[PDB]
Design a protein around this ligand. Structure first.
Ligand code: FDE
Ligand SMILES: [N]
Length: 184
């Protein structure tokens, strides 16, 4: 179960975050960490598409090759805090698993600037028991976490040393599919 009410960044700039571009997960912290593998690849694109706030996700397990995409129309709880009822789609947006009650995640943007971010996410999926998952994002898939985002990790009373890097997994991403999924 999730336990954190993450606080959104003061002065969060939604139009900059939700600009349609890709964010790569570079490091993550799962508070119930047999919930996610120690090796993993994820990325997202976030933007407004025909007036609707949307997020597209990509996950890839670099060892098993398990792959999936998702898209959601986000609902606003407060500035920087969203609820996302997801559908699993192929890379082209064709629905594999429709939106369903109880399949949603929340996310909170704790820190963002033009190039980096710290988010909290709480996933709910069927009768699974999942916990809080923080992620450091960058616009550049290879970027080491800088002082702005690391300071935000400390300000959340977390230790960056505990975050697991994605950098050594040979992750390669289909950026074109994340961007195009925003419309789907
Ligand atoms: C490492 C990592 C990182 C991440 C991130 C993320 C973000 C930012 C967001 C998210 C979300 C999500 N996820 Fe995530 N993630 C991860 C992981 C994961 C896993 C392992 C999974 C599977 C689960 C189950 O089913 O069991 C997921 C998962 C997930 C999901 C589900 C999808 C479907 O369709 O089913 C979702 C919605 N993820 N995510
Ligand atoms: N996740």
């Amino acid at each position: 179960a999730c336990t954190k009410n993450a606080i959104a960044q003061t002065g969060f700039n939604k139009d900059k975050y939700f600009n349609g571009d890709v964010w790569y997960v570079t490091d993550y912290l799962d508070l119930e960490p047999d919930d996610v593998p120690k090796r993993y690849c994820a990325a997202l694109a976030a933007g407004t598409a025909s007036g609707k706030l949307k997020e597209a996700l990509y996950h890839y397990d670099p060892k098993t090759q398990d792959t999936f995409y998702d898209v959601s129309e986000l609902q606003v709880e407060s500035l920087g805090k969203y609820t996302a009822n997801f559908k699993k789609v192929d890379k082209n947006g064709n629905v594999k698993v429709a939106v369903t009650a109880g399949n949603y995640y929340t996310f909170t943007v704790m820190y963002a600037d033009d190039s980096s971010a710290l988010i909290h996410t709480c996933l709910h999926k069927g009768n699974k028991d999942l916990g809080d998952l923080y992620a450091v994002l960058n616009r550049n898939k290879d970027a080491a976490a800088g002082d702005k985002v690391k300071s935000a990790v400390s300000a959340a009373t977390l230790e960056f040393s505990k975050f697991i890097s994605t950098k050594e997994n040979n992750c390669a991403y289909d950026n074109d599919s994340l961007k195009s999924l925003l419309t789907k």
